[PDB]
Nucleic acid binder design. Sequence first.
DNA 1: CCGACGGCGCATCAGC
DNA 2: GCTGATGCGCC
DNA 3: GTCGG
Length: 326
Amino acid sequence: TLNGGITDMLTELANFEKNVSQAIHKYNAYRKAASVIAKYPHKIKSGAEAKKLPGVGTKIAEKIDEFLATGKLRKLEKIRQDDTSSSINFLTRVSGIGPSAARKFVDEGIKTLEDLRKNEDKLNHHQRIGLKYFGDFEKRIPREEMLQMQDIVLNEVKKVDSEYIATVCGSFRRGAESSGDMDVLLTHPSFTSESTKQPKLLHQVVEQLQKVHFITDTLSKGETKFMGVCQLPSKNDEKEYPHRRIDIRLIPKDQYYCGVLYFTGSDIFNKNMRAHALEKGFTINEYTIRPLGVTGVAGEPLPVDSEKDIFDYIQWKYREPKDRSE
DNA sequence: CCGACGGCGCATCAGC
DNA sequence: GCTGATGCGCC
DNA sequence: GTCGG
Ligand SMILES: [Cl-]
Ligand SMILES: [Cl-]
Ligand SMILES: [Cl-]
Ligand SMILES: [Cl-]
Ligand SMILES: [Mg+2]
Ligand SMILES: [Mg+2]
Ligand code: NA
Ligand code: NA
Ligand code: NA
Ligand code: NA
């Protein structure tokens, strides 16, 4: 982190744009700039130097000059002092409260953790769980703990059906020493792009993980995606482990490589790769890569037998997961 | 200058 | 009840 | 806010 000061500033700007201004393209622009600066291997000496990086433009270069000179950004100093902006930014830290809900809550006068706790009746199911575990959800998960969680999930899934394959993705698969949450990609030969030969494939797995008290709460659940809370078991006399977020995604078995590409991320990596695909005349989702016809309609799914095949289509050199942390 | 900016699952609500 | 919009979430 | 054409 040679340029941590700058990347922190840009991230705070991004969050303000997303949460307060509700400007999603500005949010993405700031994050893209922060990401490109974060991997730049020199300590940045000026705005002009930064402006040579793709995604850093005139306005960001100016902000960088201000920050290098003074160590702060007047724009941010003002935003921090603003009560409405401060409140909104805080409320969006609760899982389930977005920019819209946060602004609506602040209008009602609900703008602190204390206010939230006394107005549970005003929260939906997801938000009530987000509040319950507010503290826990902001803690990172050490890789050592991720390994214990992997063992529980993989062993429990095997007990449901030995044909399931579960893969931990996200930052874990990128080799991070700590993770924000646990991301699990699940496949079963009965669920392909052509047919669903068994019902409740995801349900059976969630149920089993609940039965062993690993999964503790549910935020949302459908046929292909579960979003919930889990917790490692603690030993006798041991303090409990924090509750953790868990996401499970059931992907058609024949579409594993596209699925694991998506779920490995990072998010900014996915955005960059998908944008590059479009420039190259292709569209990528978690299921397929398809050509874009002259008109605009996506064509038929192209053959994929490896993650690398996807990179080959868009003429990118292959990047191992560890090199996708953007 | 101006259009595009990644793609999608689940929850909630309005209209019919 | 369904369909489409919108919010919020995931990478 | 930035980029491409
Ligand atoms: Cl915007
Ligand atoms: Cl600052
Ligand atoms: Cl695939
Ligand atoms: Cl598809
Ligand atoms: Mg994750
Ligand atoms: Mg994430
Ligand atoms: Na630039
Ligand atoms: Na939130
Ligand atoms: Na996740
Ligand atoms: Na573009």
